[PDB]
Structure 1
Amino acid sequence: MKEFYLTVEQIGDSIFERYIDSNGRERTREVEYKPSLFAHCPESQATKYFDIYGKPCTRKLFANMRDASQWIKRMEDIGLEALGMDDFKLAYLSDTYNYEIKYDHTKIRVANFDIEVTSPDGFPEPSQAKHPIDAITHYDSIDDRFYVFDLLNSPYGNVEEWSIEIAAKLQEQGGDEVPSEIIDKIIYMPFDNEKELLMEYLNFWQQKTPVILTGWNVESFAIPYVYNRIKNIFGESTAKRLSPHRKTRVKVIENMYGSREIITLFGISVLDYIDLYKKFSFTNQPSYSLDYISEFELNVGKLKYDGPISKLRESNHQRYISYNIIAVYRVLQIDAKRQFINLSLDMGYYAKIQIQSVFSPIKTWDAIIFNSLKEQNKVIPQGRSHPVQPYPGAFVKEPIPNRYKYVMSFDLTSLYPSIIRQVNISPETIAGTFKVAPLHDYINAVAERPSDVYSCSPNGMMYYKDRDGVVPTEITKVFNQRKEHKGYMLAAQRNGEIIKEALHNPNLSVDEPLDVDYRFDFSDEIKEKIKKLSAKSLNEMLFRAQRTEVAGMTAQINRKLLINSLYGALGNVWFRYYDLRNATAITTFGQMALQWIERKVNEYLNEVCGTEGEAFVLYGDTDSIYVSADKIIDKVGESKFRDTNHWVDFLDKFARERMEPAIDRGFREMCEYMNNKQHLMFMDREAIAGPPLGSKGIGGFWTGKKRYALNVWDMEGTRYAEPKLKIMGLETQKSSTPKAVQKALKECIRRMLQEGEESLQEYFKEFEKEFRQLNYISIASVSSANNIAKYDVGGFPGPKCPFHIRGILTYNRAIKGNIDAPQVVEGEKVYVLPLREGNPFGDKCIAWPSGTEITDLIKDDVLHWMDYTVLLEKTFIKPLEGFTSAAKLDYEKKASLFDMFDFH
């Protein structure tokens, strides 16, 4: 097989690489790497190396990496540019792997582990690590085994051995429901003291040194706790043995609020799944504890235990160990469904970077462009310390707060990457500048044509049309690769169809699966002598066709992620190819494009309806526009459609045949007016919105910018049998809103758009009488807890103290002394509840750590003292009025008409 890397590090004047060799073995090597950096030279001096601007450069080979870094330092002092890759690790990978990397994940040791630490006095801080580690469950992907280390004797109790027999039994048979899938794969190792346990795990660690280290909160707790515990007991030198290169660095992660420290293990790529989930899941959650996420993803219920956490090992050591094994397994169960590790591997080897850096879109792109330019014998620019300044952004239309019965949305495809290609925006394609008129004047096409020869942006930027931009070339590649992997995936789908028919008429003799590539579809010469073969062989041919099918999609998704991350990289001052004027050009063009087409959609729909000056486009956000279809329906009349599906079909056919060409014609004009390189402003129909036919529903409503609800029947030519609610920005789509309220508001919204005013009033009136009977967790608001110490004056609220913080300072007075009680960690979110006047606290709200039941120490009183009326008025009624006043609806029987005016 072709060789590939695992981890890369720079220690002094030598790089340390762990890799898989040509024969499958995991090997390690030290290289006195000889880097190269580039500098400007005279024209007469001949080389093959040029920079992105076209200027000539000379290659300067250094004896060692220190000489290379000391040289850049000198170039800074005198005021000249030092060209080339200054991250010598990256340059090493590029040299040693100067080809498309193909990796075998089976060879990659992916370890995920969780530790248990019994701590009677609150949370065990990892920096001190003063409490014994009484359990370690470590899973090795190559071994496919769970390695369990269980401390039997500690200051906090002596326990019997854990029973794998009992851990297999049912929950009603004696607890612990460790699944049959993993019961065979557990290796259990008991220990008499802590020193024996830690020294064995460290020996185990040498034998099975992880390439990828994963788990939940592994980098902020498990790693630094294990490291510090070993260190404090045995010494620095024993603790540094966790690194295969025997080197560890303490890194202090700094925020603007709440600081912590992490342990870097050189030669190990740590992918903490919590951070991995927070990045790629693209959905905000009320709690980021493992139990809440397992609940969401796997549907699997609560991993319950009796009593507190600190007394679980003492009271039920049997469950304690099982709880730890399953915790590891639930992370393994998620990665089986989301595949976030294989995704970050596939992204890492593509860009030729160390895997940890996939948390940085900056580092990823910096290396994708680097590799392509190096292939052309081109030299990358120097990192330039740019100052921070917030440039303009996207256009947002202020909508008139009203009801909207029929709506058709239209969306642009990958707007910002598309702009970059269309205008040919790159740091090295800046042709010049022109004097600009107000944006409005470019939107209505009254401002004079910017340039006859150059591609233009409304902010004044001109770009060459004849050049091939470094940025646009590299994004078109990813765009072509996305398009190419459709060709491979859909080919396997066409080949997979004639397998159930191939197995329907078989003839068995000998298993003969012919070795052919599944990425390219078979011809009539291959299809003929492939269905007359054996029945047993067709099973493996389908197995490999599906293996290739998913493999095409996996690579396809990794390209869209790369597509959507480019703009964000170009807007960051730390990016190598960052240019303020370029970012503004990308963004301001979008502002114009959206408002241009809005101006063209209105002009068109006025011609075909025989009216003038009517506003059809109600709302437009960044890349999408929303068209009021009311008058299109009113043109042919509502009482001429037979069913709901009939008018939806009409608006679909109208967009396809009449509107889309009008849109396309308008953007072509915008391309010529701007004199752009290529027309790539493609806009297509998104959602058709409205109420059921012959119903009292309102179809949809806006309340303001980024706050609307629609009843959608069709999304991009996909007809829903039962209509879906597309609510955006409203209280139902916010993690700050209580769970029972979240569902009750959505029902109110549902009754508004589909059923009418009568139904809303019927639902609200009933919800009034039957409110206090619901769950207290489902009626508690969620908010992040940042800067608690900022407003903390002796446990009391200081100047301008927030409402969620006012609950934490009420919490601290409630649990004063009790260290058995749970603590509020900064950053971690909190459940907020309001309590009426005369309460036994001081203030008017209390808050507790989100994702859990509130402690029994204060649940006695809080559940009694909390005012539902205030909680109803603040989280349900006040938002409800927001919807109704905008929709021109009433939730209550008799609300006077005159109580809507602002008056004197």
Structure 2
Amino acid sequence: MKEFYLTVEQIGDSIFERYIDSNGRERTREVEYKPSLFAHCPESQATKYFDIYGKPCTRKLFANMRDASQWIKRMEDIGLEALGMDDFKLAYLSDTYNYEIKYDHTKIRVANFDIEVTSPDGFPEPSQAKHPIDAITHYDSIDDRFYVFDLLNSPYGNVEEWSIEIAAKLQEQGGDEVPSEIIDKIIYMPFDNEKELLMEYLNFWQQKTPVILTGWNVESFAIPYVYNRIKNIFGESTAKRLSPHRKTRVKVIENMYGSREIITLFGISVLDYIDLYKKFSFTNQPSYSLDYISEFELNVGKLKYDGPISKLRESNHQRYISYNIIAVYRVLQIDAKRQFINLSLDMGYYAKIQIQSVFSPIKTWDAIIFNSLKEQNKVIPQGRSHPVQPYPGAFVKEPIPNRYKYVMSFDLTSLYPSIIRQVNISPETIAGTFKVAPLHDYINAVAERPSDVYSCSPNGMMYYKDRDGVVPTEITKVFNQRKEHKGYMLAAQRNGEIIKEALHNPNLSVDEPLDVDYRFDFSDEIKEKIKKLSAKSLNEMLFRAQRTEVAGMTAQINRKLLINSLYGALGNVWFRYYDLRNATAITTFGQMALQWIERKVNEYLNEVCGTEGEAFVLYGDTDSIYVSADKIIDKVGESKFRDTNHWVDFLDKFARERMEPAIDRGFREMCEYMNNKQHLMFMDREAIAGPPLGSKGIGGFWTGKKRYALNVWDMEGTRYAEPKLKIMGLETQKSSTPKAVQKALKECIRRMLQEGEESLQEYFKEFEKEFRQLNYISIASVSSANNIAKYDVGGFPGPKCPFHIRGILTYNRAIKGNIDAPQVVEGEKVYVLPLREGNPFGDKCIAWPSGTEITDLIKDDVLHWMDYTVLLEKTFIKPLEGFTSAAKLDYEKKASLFDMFDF
């Protein structure tokens, strides 16, 4: 097989690497790597190395990586550029694997673990590990086994061995329902004392050292704990064995609210699944706890249990161990869905970087470009520092708050990457500048054409149209690879049909399947040989056909991630190819683009409607615009459509047959006006929305920028079974809005867009007569807890003290001197709730622990005093009032018209 690398590190003047060799064996090797950097030399010195600006360059092969850095610092002092790949690990990688890295994941040891640590004095600080580690479940992908390390005796208790038979039984039988899928894959090892367990674990860790290390919060908790527990008991020398190179570094990460520390295990790739989730799930969750995430993804969480975990080991050591096993398994299941691990490996090996680096857009791209410029003997610029200066971004239209009956939205494909290609924006293609007229002037096409020689951007930048830019070349490559791989998937779909005769005409001649590449559909070669094939081969063959169906996805979707991250890197100063002007070039071009087309779409709809000045585009945001299709539906007359679907098709047709063409003509002119290297401004009809035909619904409405709701029937050409509610910004998308309320608001909107004013009015009134009766906990809100220890004066409200941080305290006070009642904390979220006046509790409100009910020591009265009125008002009404005033609807009869005037 073709060998590859697992991990790489630089320790002193040597490169330590773990890797898979020609025969599948894992190997570790040290290398006295010789880095090569470059300096600008005299043109009269014929060579083969040039930078992205064509200037000739001389290679400087150093003795060791230190001289290399010594030179870089020396150069910086003199004031002359030091070109080349300074991250010697990256260079080492390009150099050792200059080719298409094909890895065999079944050889990559990916470990998933979780530990349990009984503590009665609160959350166990990892940087101290004051308490014993009483459990460790460490799943290993090579052995496909769960290794359980159970501590039978500790200062907190002595317990019996965990029973696997009991773990398998059902809940009603006193079991733990440990799934049958893994019941046979568990390897239980009980221990008499912690030291015996830790040492056996550490030994286990050498026999099977992880390459990829994951789990939930494993990098902020598990790893740091285990490391410090072991260090505090056996000394740092034994602790550093967790690293295959016996090297570890404490890394102190610090944010805008403080700091914590994680432990770097040289020779290991830590892809903590929580982080692997927060960055590839694309969706905000009100809680990122494994229980919350596991439920949201598999309709089931972590084992249930009675009492506080703090006492779960003692009172029920059986559940305790099972719990720890299910927690490790949940992660594995959540990854059986997301493939974020495979995604990572794939992305990392494509760019030839350290797997954990995929969390870094900058690093991934830096690496992909460096390998490209390397193949063509070019030398990358030298990273330089730049002030952190903000630049303008996307144009957002100030929508006129109102209901909007019929709406059609068009979007622009990969806006920014597209813009970079069309204008040819790169640092080495900057040709010059030009006097800049007000932006609107270019929007209205009444400004002296920038230049007839170079590709332009509304901010005054000009680019060469002959040269193919470094940045744009690279995106165009990824852009093609995508169509390429997602091209193989369109084929594996044609072979999944031809090879879809499991019982159609399965001949009875036992034969062997074929080696035809499903990437490329069949012709006659093997296409002919699909009949005489038995009913058995047909199935073993489609097993090899579908398998590729996903193969493309991994790469194609992985390319989509790349494409979409390029902008961020380009706008970040720590990027080798960053350029303030180029970033602004991009952003401003887009501002122009989106508004140029708004002018065009308006002008075009005004002619086809014989209207004058009418404003058809009602809202635009970055890469999309929404048009009011009212004036259109009216030419044809609303009373002439057989039903909802009739007018949807009418709009769908007018879109594809009339607007798109007018749109492309529009962008094609813009491309000429800016004298761009290539027209790439492509818009697509997106959604079509409106109320159900023959109903009193309003269809849609905007509250303001980033805040609207539509009733969509067809999206990008996919006619829904039932209309879909598309809501942006409104509180029903507010991860911080109660659930009972987040529901109504949703219902309220639906009744507004599809049923009408009387419907909304009948709901609202009921939701009031029955708000009390609603579960008392189905009301509280949500929010992050930052600087909690800033607005506390002896645990009291200080200056600018937020509304929750105050309740928090009238809770600490109502139960002061007690750790038997739910314990609060920071970085979390709490149930907030207003209390009437004259309440013996503390303030106007009172917050408390999330995911829990109020301790029966304050529960009884809290409810007795809670403010329902104030609660309904600020969480339900205020926002509805907001929706209905915009949509010009009343949620309550006898309301007065004048109330809408600002006099």
CA offsets 1:771-802 (integer angstroms, 9 cap, x no match): 11222332111000001112122111111111
The question of whether the paired residues in 2 share the 8 Å contact of 1:492 and 1:549 is answered with yes
Which structure exhibits the higher relative contact order, with contacts defined as CA atoms closer than 8 Å and separated by 6 or more residues? 1
- In 2, Cα distance between the equivalents of 1:316 and 1:264? 35
The question of whether the paired residues in 1 share the 8 Å contact of 2:738 and 2:782 is answered with yes
Shift of 1:534: 2.0
- In 2, Cα distance between the equivalents of 1:439 and 1:850? 49
* Aligned 1:188-587 pairs, distance under 5 A: 188-300=188-300, 303-501=303-501, 503-587=503-587
Shift of 1:206: 0.5
- In 1, Cα distance between the equivalents of 2:386 and 2:824? 38
- In 1, Cα distance between the equivalents of 2:391 and 2:852? 42
Specify the alignment match of 1:660 in structure 2: 660
SS of the counterpart of 1:662? helix
Shift of 1:135: 0.5
Closer, same or farther: CA 858–215 of 1 in aligned 2, 3 Å: farther
- In 2, Cα distance between the equivalents of 1:225 and 1:860? 39
Q: Structure 2: where are the runs of 5+ without partners?
A: none
The question of whether the paired residues in 2 share the 8 Å contact of 1:502 and 1:531 is answered with no
- In 1, Cα distance between the equivalents of 2:840 and 2:40? 75
Shift of 1:242: 0.3
- In 2, Cα distance between the equivalents of 1:381 and 1:617? 44
Closer, same or farther: CA 820–24 of 1 in aligned 2, 3 Å: farther
Closer, same or farther: CA 40–822 of 1 in aligned 2, 3 Å: farther
Closer, same or farther: CA 302–124 of 1 in aligned 2, 3 Å: closer
- In 2, Cα distance between the equivalents of 1:361 and 1:268? 20
Closer, same or farther: CA 821–253 of 1 in aligned 2, 3 Å: farther
Closer, same or farther: CA 857–61 of 1 in aligned 2, 3 Å: farther
SS of the counterpart of 1:745? helix
- In 2, Cα distance between the equivalents of 1:689 and 1:302? 41
- In 2, Cα distance between the equivalents of 1:852 and 1:333? 26
Shift of 1:239: 0.4
Closer, same or farther: CA 514–461 of 1 in aligned 2, 3 Å: same
TM-score by length of 1: 0.99
Closer, same or farther: CA 274–491 of 1 in aligned 2, 3 Å: same
CA offsets 1:243-271 (integer angstroms, 9 cap, x no match): 00001111111111031111110000001
Shift of 1:852: 3.8
Closer, same or farther: CA 270–853 of 1 in aligned 2, 3 Å: farther
SS of the counterpart of 2:726? strand
Shift of 1:856: 4.1
The question of whether the paired residues in 1 share the 8 Å contact of 2:509 and 2:532 is answered with no
CA offsets 1:795-821 (integer angstroms, 9 cap, x no match): 111111111222333333344332344
CA offsets 1:328-360 (integer angstroms, 9 cap, x no match): 000001000111100011000000000111111
CA offsets 1:132-180 (integer angstroms, 9 cap, x no match): 1110001000000000000001111110111101101000011301000
- In 2, Cα distance between the equivalents of 1:293 and 1:824? 21
- In 2, Cα distance between the equivalents of 1:619 and 1:268? 49
The question of whether the paired residues in 2 share the 8 Å contact of 1:435 and 1:460 is answered with yes
Closer, same or farther: CA 660–756 of 1 in aligned 2, 3 Å: same
Shift of 1:635: 0.9
Shift of 1:301: 5.2
- In 1, Cα distance between the equivalents of 2:859 and 2:383? 56
The question of whether the paired residues in 1 share the 8 Å contact of 2:302 and 2:327 is answered with no
Shift of 1:839: 2.8
CA offsets 1:518-547 (integer angstroms, 9 cap, x no match): 211111232112321222111111000011
The question of whether the paired residues in 1 share the 8 Å contact of 2:499 and 2:530 is answered with no
- In 2, Cα distance between the equivalents of 1:474 and 1:369? 7
Moved more, 585-594 or 862-871: 862-871
Closer, same or farther: CA 235–301 of 1 in aligned 2, 3 Å: closer
- In 2, Cα distance between the equivalents of 1:291 and 1:821? 21
The question of whether the paired residues in 2 share the 8 Å contact of 1:169 and 1:176 is answered with yes
Shift of 1:30: 0.3
- In 1, Cα distance between the equivalents of 2:697 and 2:581? 48
Shift of 1:827: 2.7
- In 2, Cα distance between the equivalents of 1:626 and 1:593? 15
- In 1, Cα distance between the equivalents of 2:172 and 2:777? 27
Closer, same or farther: CA 87–825 of 1 in aligned 2, 3 Å: farther
Identity score, percent: 100
Shift of 1:440: 0.5
CA offsets 1:281-304 (integer angstroms, 9 cap, x no match): 001001111100111000125621
Shift of 1:374: 0.3
Moved more, 305-314 or 523-532: 523-532
The question of whether the paired residues in 2 share the 8 Å contact of 1:407 and 1:689 is answered with yes
The question of whether the paired residues in 1 share the 8 Å contact of 2:301 and 2:330 is answered with no
The question of whether the paired residues in 2 share the 8 Å contact of 1:402 and 1:703 is answered with yes
CA offsets 1:718-760 (integer angstroms, 9 cap, x no match): 0011000001110101101101101101000000000011111
- In 2, Cα distance between the equivalents of 1:345 and 1:823? 40
- In 2, Cα distance between the equivalents of 1:502 and 1:839? 72
Shift of 1:308: 1.0
Q: CA RMSD in A?
A: 1.2
CA offsets 1:51-101 (integer angstroms, 9 cap, x no match): 001111110011101111111010111111100010000100100000010
The question of whether the paired residues in 2 share the 8 Å contact of 1:834 and 1:871 is answered with yes
- In 1, Cα distance between the equivalents of 2:574 and 2:849? 36
SS of the counterpart of 1:133? coil
Shift of 1:840: 3.0
- In 1, Cα distance between the equivalents of 2:747 and 2:317? 46
Aligned residue-pair number: 903
SS of the counterpart of 2:493? helix
The question of whether the paired residues in 2 share the 8 Å contact of 1:503 and 1:538 is answered with no
The question of whether the paired residues in 2 share the 8 Å contact of 1:286 and 1:850 is answered with no
Shift of 1:866: 1.5
SS of the counterpart of 1:885? helix
SS of the counterpart of 1:219? coil
Shift of 1:228: 0.5
Moved more, 496-505 or 780-789: 496-505
The question of whether the paired residues in 2 share the 8 Å contact of 1:761 and 1:893 is answered with yes
- In 1, Cα distance between the equivalents of 2:237 and 2:539? 55
- In 1, Cα distance between the equivalents of 2:252 and 2:568? 25
Moved more, 422-431 or 766-775: 766-775
Specify the alignment match of 1:861 in structure 2: 861
CA offsets 1:201-239 (integer angstroms, 9 cap, x no match): 000000010001000010111000100000111100010
- In 1, Cα distance between the equivalents of 2:281 and 2:853? 26
CA offsets 1:607-648 (integer angstroms, 9 cap, x no match): 110111100000000000000000101111111111111000
- In 2, Cα distance between the equivalents of 1:855 and 1:10? 53
Specify the alignment match of 2:89 in structure 1: 89
- In 2, Cα distance between the equivalents of 1:375 and 1:338? 34
SS of the counterpart of 2:710? strand
Specify the alignment match of 1:778 in structure 2: 778
The question of whether the paired residues in 2 share the 8 Å contact of 1:412 and 1:682 is answered with yes
- In 1, Cα distance between the equivalents of 2:70 and 2:820? 54
SS of the counterpart of 1:547? helix
- In 2, Cα distance between the equivalents of 1:786 and 1:417? 36
Specify the alignment match of 1:874 in structure 2: 874
Moved more, 858-867 or 636-645: 858-867
CA offsets 1:369-411 (integer angstroms, 9 cap, x no match): 0100000000001111111011011000001101100000010
SS of the counterpart of 2:5? strand
- In 1, Cα distance between the equivalents of 2:766 and 2:130? 55
- In 2, Cα distance between the equivalents of 1:718 and 1:358? 34
- In 1, Cα distance between the equivalents of 2:465 and 2:134? 67
CA offsets 1:307-344 (integer angstroms, 9 cap, x no match): 11111111011101000000000000100011110001
- In 1, Cα distance between the equivalents of 2:252 and 2:545? 48
- In 1, Cα distance between the equivalents of 2:525 and 2:502? 16
Closer, same or farther: CA 823–66 of 1 in aligned 2, 3 Å: farther
- In 1, Cα distance between the equivalents of 2:794 and 2:65? 53
The question of whether the paired residues in 2 share the 8 Å contact of 1:129 and 1:228 is answered with yes
The question of whether the paired residues in 1 share the 8 Å contact of 2:302 and 2:326 is answered with no
Shift of 1:854: 4.1
- In 2, Cα distance between the equivalents of 1:293 and 1:125? 24
- In 2, Cα distance between the equivalents of 1:357 and 1:615? 48
Specify the alignment match of 1:594 in structure 2: 594
SS of the counterpart of 2:136? strand
- In 1, Cα distance between the equivalents of 2:253 and 2:811? 28
Shift of 1:828: 2.6
SS of the counterpart of 1:781? coil
- In 2, Cα distance between the equivalents of 1:49 and 1:857? 76
- In 1, Cα distance between the equivalents of 2:820 and 2:591? 55
Shift of 1:517: 1.6
The question of whether the paired residues in 2 share the 8 Å contact of 1:110 and 1:214 is answered with yes
TM-score by length of 2: 0.99
